[PDB]
C-alpha cells in the first residue's frame, strides 16, 4: 500500500481487502465487492454444504462484482429491459459464493445497523450484482451498512437426495447462512453492528428469510426480518423429501445417470447440462412452480413451514411483510396461453379454465371448479378483461397474497410484532404493459432508492416516495418499527393483528390504513382449499 486510498483498506478474517470509492447522488460511499466467504463449491464439492473460505495472502481486490451462480438465463423477450434487468450481469460460474458490502464513506464512527439483502428468482436464478440491488443509495442517504450475498440456485443449490451424504439438500440456504455468520464475525471491521442485523428479501428471497426464522441455527444470526412478496409456507417454496428425491433421480436420468454413485455421476456433468434439463422434472404443466427448492429434510427445516409457524414462539420477532398490487400478472406471460406482453391479453372463459389448471397444478377437478366459481364474476362470466384479471388474481392469491396473509396471522397470533403493507405504485419507467399493473419485483427499485439517481428519469414524486420507503425500511432495521419517532402523525403505521388486521398502502399519497388482507378470499385458499384437496 502507500499510495492507495486509506479509507478503502479493511481486514477480514480471511485477509486484507481493497474496496472502491463510489459516487452516489449526494456523496461518496465505500464499496467492497466480491468478498469470497466460501470455498468454491466446484468439482467434488458440487451439491455439498459450503465450507468457509480459506484465508488468502496479500490484498484481495474487492472493487468489482464477482461471478453469478450458474443458472438458467431468460430469453422469452430478447433485448427487452423488463426481462434483461433480472438476467445475470456477470459471468456464470459455479465458483460464485461471494458477497458485497456497502457502507458510508468514510466508514461509520459508531456501530451501524446492518441490512442483509437476499435476492429472489425462484431458487433457480438471481444475483446480488443486479442494478436494482445497488446498495449505494441506502448507504449514502441512510448511513446503512448493506450486505448482499450470492447463493447457489437451481440444482447446484437445491438438488437433494434426502438422507444422503453427498446431496443433503438446502445447501443454497446453507450458503446464505454462512454469509450470515461471516457478517457476525466480520462486519464490525466496516463499522457494522453485528447486534443489529436485519434480513430482507423478495420472492424466493422472502421465502429464504422466512426459513432462517424457522431454523434454529440461523436464529442467532439476525434480529429482525423483512419479507417482501414471499413466504416459507405456501405451494412453491418447499418440497417434501419424497418429491425432492423423485425430481433428483428423474433429472439424473435425463442427463444420463445407490445415492453415492448417482451423485458421483451428476458431479461429472457440465453445469450447463444440468441447467438444460432442470425444467423437465416438474409433475405438471405449471407456472409459479420451480423444480429445485428448499426441501423439508427434518434438519435445516425440522418440519413443514406450516407446522413450524403453527407451533412456534415468535415473541422475540419483529417482522415487516408485504405484497404488490399485482403479484400474479408477471407469471402469466411465462406459460398461460392467451397471455402476452405485446397485446392486451384479453382471454376467453375457456382459456381461463385452462389457465386455472396451470396456475393451480395440484388441483383435482372439483378443486379447480371451486377456484373458477370463486373467481368468476357472475354478472359478466364471459367478459375477457375480467377473466384476464381473475387469472392474474388466482395466481397472485394462491402463491403470495394468501400465504403472506396466513403468515402475518400466525406470527401475530404467537408473539411476533408484525407490520404489513400493500405496495401500489407503478413505476413511471416500467416497460411491461399496463394490464400487468404493479408486477412482482417492482417495489425493489424504490426500497433501494434508485429513483434518487438523476440519470434514471424517475419523476420528482417518485424520488420523494423512494425516500419514504427507504425511511420505513431503515427505521424498521434500527428499531423494529417503520415509524419515524421524530416525524409525528403521517399518520402512523399500526402493527398487524389478528383482531384488527390492519396494513398500510404504499403509493404516492400518504400512508392509508386498511383492514383485512384479502380476508374473504384467503379463507378460501387457506381454510377451505386444503380440506377440499384432502377429501378428493
For residues 218 and 276, give the distance between their C-alpha atoms in angstroms, rounded to a whole number.
33
All three cell numbers of 171: 445447501
> Judged by CB under 6 A, which stretch of 15-23, 34-42, 111-119, 339-347 contacts ligand NAG?
339-347
Least Cβ distance, residue 510 to ligand NAG (angstroms):
28
Does 340 contact ligand NAG by CB under 6 A? Answer: yes
> Judged by CB under 6 A, which stretch of 39-47, 111-119, 341-349, 394-402 contacts ligand NAG?
341-349
Q: Among 460, 465, 461, which Cα is nearest to 443's? A: 465
Least Cβ distance, residue 131 to ligand NAG (angstroms):
11
> Judged by CB under 6 A, which stretch of 30-38, 123-131, 187-195, 343-351 contacts ligand NAG?
343-351
All three cell numbers of 315: 415473541
Does 354 contact ligand NAG by CB under 6 A? Answer: no
Question: Cβ(148)–Cβ(118) under 8 Å?
Answer: yes
Residues 327, 333, 339, 341: what is their CA dihedral angle, to the nearest 10 degrees? 100
Instruction: Please pick, from the candidates 457, 459, 490, 498, the single residue that binds ligand NAG as defined by CB under 6 A.
Output: 457
Residues 306 to 325: which contact ligand NAG by CB under 6 A?
A: none
Does 346 contact ligand NAG by CB under 6 A? Answer: yes
Least Cβ distance, residue 456 to ligand NAG (angstroms):
7
* Residue number with CB closer to ligand NAG (48 or 436): 436
For residues 346 and 367, give the distance between their C-alpha atoms in angstroms, rounded to a whole number.
24
Instruction: Please pick, from the candidates 302, 310, 343, 362, the single residue that binds ligand NAG as defined by CB under 6 A.
Output: 343
Least Cβ distance, residue 511 to ligand NAG (angstroms):
29
* Residue number with CB closer to ligand NAG (338 or 403): 338
Q: Name the one residue in this structure whose C-alpha cell is 396456475.
A: 359
Q: How many residues bind ligand NAG (CB under 6 A)?
A: 8
* Residue number with CB closer to ligand NAG (25 or 480): 25
Q: Which residues contact 197 (CB under 8 A, 6 or more apart)?
A: 113, 114, 116, 180, 183, 184, 187, 221, 222, 223, 224
Does 303 contact ligand NAG by CB under 6 A? Answer: no
For residues 11 and 13, give the distance between their C-alpha atoms in angstroms, rounded to a whole number.
7
The DSSP bridge partners found for residue 224 are 198, 318
> Judged by CB under 6 A, which stretch of 7-15, 161-169, 312-320, 342-350 contacts ligand NAG?
342-350
Question: Cβ(148)–Cβ(68) under 8 Å?
Answer: no
Q: Among 263, 267, 203, which Cα is nearest to 237's? A: 203
All three cell numbers of 46: 458440487
* Residue number with CB closer to ligand NAG (127 or 347): 347
Residues with a catalytic annotation lie at 203, 327, 440
- SS3 breakdown of the chain: % helix, strand, coil, rounded to 5? 40, 15, 45
Cis geometry, peptide bond prior to residue 491 (ω within 30 degrees of 0): yes
* Residue number with CB closer to ligand NAG (307 or 346): 346
Q: Among 231, 229, 230, 212, which Cα is nearest to 221's? A: 212
The DSSP bridge partners found for residue 63 are 33
Least Cβ distance, residue 454 to ligand NAG (angstroms):
10
Least Cβ distance, residue 347 to ligand NAG (angstroms):
7
Least Cβ distance, residue 531 to ligand NAG (angstroms):
36
Does 240 contact ligand NAG by CB under 6 A? Answer: no
* Residue number with CB closer to ligand NAG (133 or 292): 133
* Residue number with CB closer to ligand NAG (60 or 354): 354
For residues 356 and 330, give the distance between their C-alpha atoms in angstroms, rounded to a whole number.
15
Instruction: Please pick, from the candidates 338, 403, 441, 482, the single residue that binds ligand NAG as defined by CB under 6 A.
Output: 338
Does 344 contact ligand NAG by CB under 6 A? Answer: yes
Least Cβ distance, residue 84 to ligand NAG (angstroms):
12
* Residue number with CB closer to ligand NAG (318 or 345): 345
* Residue number with CB closer to ligand NAG (73 or 76): 76
- Sheet with 20-24: list strands edge to edge: 20-24, 27-35, 99-104, 145-149, 112-118, 192-202, 224-228, 318-324, 417-423, 502-506, 512-515
- In angstroms, how far is CA 210 from the centroid of its own chain? 10
For residues 534 and 18, give the distance between their C-alpha atoms in angstroms, rounded to a whole number.
57
**Which SS3 state, helix, strand or coil, does residue 18 take?**
strand
Least Cβ distance, residue 374 to ligand NAG (angstroms):
24
Q: Which residues contact 288 (CB under 8 A, 6 or more apart)?
A: 235, 236, 328, 331, 359, 395, 398, 399
Question: Cβ(398)–Cβ(360) under 8 Å?
Answer: yes
Q: Which residues bind ligand NAG (CB under 6 A)?
A: 337-338, 340, 343-346, 457
Amino acid at each position: 500500500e502507500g499510495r492507495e486510498d486509506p479509507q478503502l483498506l479493511v481486514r477480514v478474517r480471511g485477509g486484507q481487502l481493497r474496496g472502491i470509492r463510489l459516487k452516489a447522488p449526494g456523496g461518496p460511499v465505500s464499496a467492497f465487492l466480491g468478498i469470497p466467504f466460501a470455498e468454491p463449491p466446484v468439482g467434488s464439492r458440487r451439491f455439498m454444504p459450503p465450507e468457509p473460505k480459506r484465508p488468502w495472502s496479500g490484498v484481495l481486490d474487492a472493487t468489482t462484482f464477482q461471478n453469478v451462480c450458474y443458472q438458467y438465463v431468460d430469453t422469452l423477450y430478447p433485448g427487452f429491459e423488463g426481462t434483461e434487468m433480472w438476467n445475470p450481469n456477470r459471468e456464470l460460474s459455479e465458483d460464485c459464493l461471494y458477497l458485497n458490502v456497502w457502507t458510508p464513506y468514510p466508514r461509520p464512527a459508531s456501530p451501524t445497523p446492518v441490512l442483509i439483502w437476499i435476492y429472489g428468482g425462484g431458487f433457480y436464478s438471481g444475483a446480488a450484482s443486479l442494478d436494482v440491488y445497488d446498495g449505494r443509495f441506502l448507504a449514502q442517504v441512510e448511513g446503512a451498512v448493506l450486505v448482499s450475498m450470492n447463493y447457489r440456485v437451481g440444482t447446484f443449490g437445491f438438488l437433494a437426495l434426502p438422507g444422503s451424504r453427498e446431496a443433503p439438500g438446502n445447501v443454497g440456504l446453507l450458503d446464505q447462512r454462512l454469509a450470515l455468520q461471516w457478517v457476525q464475525e466480520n462486519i464490525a471491521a466496516f463499522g457494522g453492528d453485528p447486534m443489529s442485523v436485519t434480513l430482507f428479501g423478495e420472492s424466493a428471497g422472502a421465502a429464504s428469510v422466512g426459513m432462517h426464522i424457522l431454523s434454529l441455527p440461523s436464529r442467532s444470526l439476525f434480529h429482525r426480518a423483512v419479507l417482501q412478496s414471499g413466504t416459507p409456507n405456501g405451494p412453491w417454496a418447499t418440497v417434501s423429501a419424497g418429491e425432492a428425491r423423485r425430481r433428483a433421480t428423474l433429472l439424473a436420468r435425463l442427463v444420463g445417470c445407490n445415492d453415492t454413485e448417482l451423485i458421483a455421476c451428476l458431479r461429472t456433468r457440465p453445469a450447463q447440462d444440468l441447467v438444460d434439463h432442470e425444467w423437465h422434472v416438474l409433475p405438471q404443466e405449471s407456472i409459479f412452480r420451480f423444480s429445485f427448492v428448499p426441501v423439508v429434510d427434518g434438519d435445516f427445516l425440522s418440519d413443514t413451514p406450516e407446522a413450524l409457524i403453527n407451533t412456534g414462539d415468535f415473541q422475540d420477532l419483529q417482522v415487516l411483510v408485504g405484497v404488490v398490487k399485482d403479484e400474479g400478472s408477471y407469471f402469466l406471460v411465462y406459460g398461460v396461453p392467451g397471455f402476452s406482453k405485446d397485446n392486451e391479453s384479453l382471454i376467453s372463459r375457456a382459456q381461463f379454465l385452462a389457465g386455472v389448471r396451470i396456475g393451480v397444478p395440484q388441483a383435482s377437478d372439483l378443486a379447480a371448479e371451486a377456484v373458477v366459481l370463486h373467481y368468476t364474476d357472475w354478472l359478466h362470466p364471459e367478459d375477457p378483461t375480467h377473466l384476464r384479471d381473475a387469472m392474474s388474481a388466482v395466481v397472485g392469491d394462491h402463491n403470495v397474497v394468501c400465504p403472506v396473509a396466513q403468515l402475518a396471522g400466525r406470527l401475530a397470533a404467537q408473539g411476533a410484532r408484525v407490520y404489513a403493507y400493500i405496495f401500489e405504485h407503478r413505476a413511471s419507467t416500467l416497460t411491461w404493459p399496463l394490464w400487468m399493473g404493479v408486477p412482482h419485483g417492482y417495489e425493489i427499485e424504490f426500497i433501494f432508492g434508485l429513483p434518487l439517481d438523476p440519470s434514471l428519469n424517475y419523476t420528482t414524486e417518485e424520488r420523494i416516495f423512494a425516500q419514504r420507503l427507504m425511511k420505513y425500511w431503515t427505521n424498521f432495521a434500527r428499531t423494529g418499527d417503520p415509524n419515524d419517532p421524530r416525524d409525528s402523525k403521517s399518520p402512523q403505521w399500526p402493527p398487524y393483528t389478528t383482531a384488527a388486521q390492519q396494513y398500510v398502502s404504499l403509493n404516492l399519497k400518504p400512508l392509508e390504513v386498511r383492514r383485512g388482507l384479502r380476508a374473504q378470499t384467503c379463507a378460501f385458499w387457506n381454510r377451505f382449499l386444503p380440506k377440499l384437496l384432502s377429501a378428493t
